[PDB]
C-alpha cells in the first residue's frame, strides 16, 4: 500500500508531518486519486491548499483546492467518481475518508476522523489511515470550532508520496 505525507502549517508555523497509508488493497481507484493529488503529478493537487472545515470531536476536512470552502475540488478521473465500495469503516481517530455531496460524488475533498464516525459508514468511502502524526491532526483539530471555521489558516505546505 502506498504511503503519502501531508506537511501542515498554521498561520505559517509548521505543525509537522502526517503520514497516511492508503488502502489500495481494498479501494485502489480511490487510493490512486488521493496519491496522485498528493504528488501533484497531474499538474494540480493538494499542495498549498487548506483544511477548510475542522470540527472538534468529529473530523478535519481538506482537499478543496479550487474554491477553498467545501464546494470544489477535482479528481484525476475527469468527473466526480463513484463510491468504489463501503468496505472499510469509520472505526476511530485517524481514519482517512472521502468527503462527498451524496452518492457517487467523490472528487478531491477528504477528511481525517478524530473520533469513531460510525454514522458515516455506508455513506463515505474510507480509503486509508494515519500511521504517523496523529498529534499533528490533534493540533489541527484544536484550531477548529462548532461551525467548522478554523481559528488559524491551516495549510498543506507540502505533500507527496513516501513509498
Ligand atoms: N449526523 C449525525 C451527527 O453528526 C454530527 C457531525 N456532523 C455531521 O455528521 C454533518 C451533518 C450535516 N452537515 C453537512 O453535511 C455539512 C455540510 C457543509 O459543511 N457544507 C459546506 C460546503 C458545501 C456543502 C454543500 C455543497 C455541496 C456541493 C456543492 C456545493 C455546496 C455544505 C457540502 O455539503 N460540501 C460537502 C463536501 C463536498 C465534497 C465533494 C464535492 C465535489 C466532488 C466532485 C467534484 C468534481 C470532481 C471532478 O470533476 O473531477 C467537485 C466537488 C463537493 C462538496 C461537505 O462538506 N459534506 C459534508 C461532509 C464532509 C466530510 C465528512 C462528512 C460530511 C457530512 C457531515 O459533515 N455531516
Author numbering: 45 to 207
Paper text:
Cyclophilin D (CypD) is unique as a mitochondrial cyclophilin and a key regulator of the mitochondrial permeability transition pore (mPTP), a transient channel on the inner mitochondrial membrane that opens under oxidative stress or high mitochondrial matrix calcium levels. A key structural feature shared among all cyclophilin isoforms is a shallow and highly conserved PPIase active site. Adjacent to the active site is the S2 pocket, a distinct exo-site that forms part of a long substrate-binding groove for peptides. In particular, three gatekeeper residues (positions 123, 124, and 145 in CypD) and one far S2 pocket residue (position 118 in CypD) are highly diverse among cyclophilins.
Potency against CypD was rescued upon distancing the carboxylate from the biphenyl group by one or two carbons (B22, IC50CypD = 0.04 μM; B23, IC50CypD = 0.0078 μM). B23 shows a dramatic improvement in subtype selectivity, with >500-fold selectivity over CypC, Cyp40, PPWD1, CypH, CypG, NKTR, 25- to 40-fold selectivity over CypA and PPIL1, and ~3-fold selectivity over CypE and CypB. While retaining the same interactions with CypD as B2, we also observed a novel hydrogen bond with the backbone of S119 and a salt bridge with the side-chain of K118, which is usually oriented away from the S2 pocket. The latter interaction explains why cyclophilins that replace the K118 residue with a glutamate (Cyp40, PPWD1), or a hydrophobic residue (CypC, PPIL1) are much less potently inhibited by B23 and B25 than cyclophilins that retain lysine at this position (CypD, CypA, CypB, CypE). CypD K118A and CypD K118E are less potently inhibited by B23 and B25 (B23, IC50CypD(K118A) = 0.07 μM, IC50CypD(K118E) = 0.18 μM; B25, IC50CypD(K118A) = 0.019 μM, IC50CypD(K118E) = 0.06 μM) than wild-type CypD (B23, IC50CypD = 0.0078 μM; B25, IC50CypD = 0.003 μM), consistent with the role of a salt bridge with K118 in enhancing CypD potency and selectivity. Given the proximal placement of the carboxylate of B23 to S123 and R124, these two residues may also contribute to the partial selectivity of B23 for CypD. We reasoned that S123 can better tolerate the carboxylate on B23 in comparison to a negatively charged Glu at this position in CypB. This hypothesis was further supported by the conformational difference in the S123 backbone loop between co-crystal structures of B2 versus B23 bound to CypD. Migration of the S123 loop in the B23–CypD structure compared to B2–CypD suggests that this conformational shift must be tolerated for any cyclophilin bound to B23. Indeed, other cyclophilins with Glu at the 123 position (CypA, CypB, CypC, Cyp40) show weaker inhibition by B23 compared to CypD. Selectivity for CypD was further improved by installing carboxylates (B23, B25) that can hydrogen bond with S119 and K118, achieving selectivity over non-lysine-containing PPIL1, Cyp40, CypC, and PPWD1.
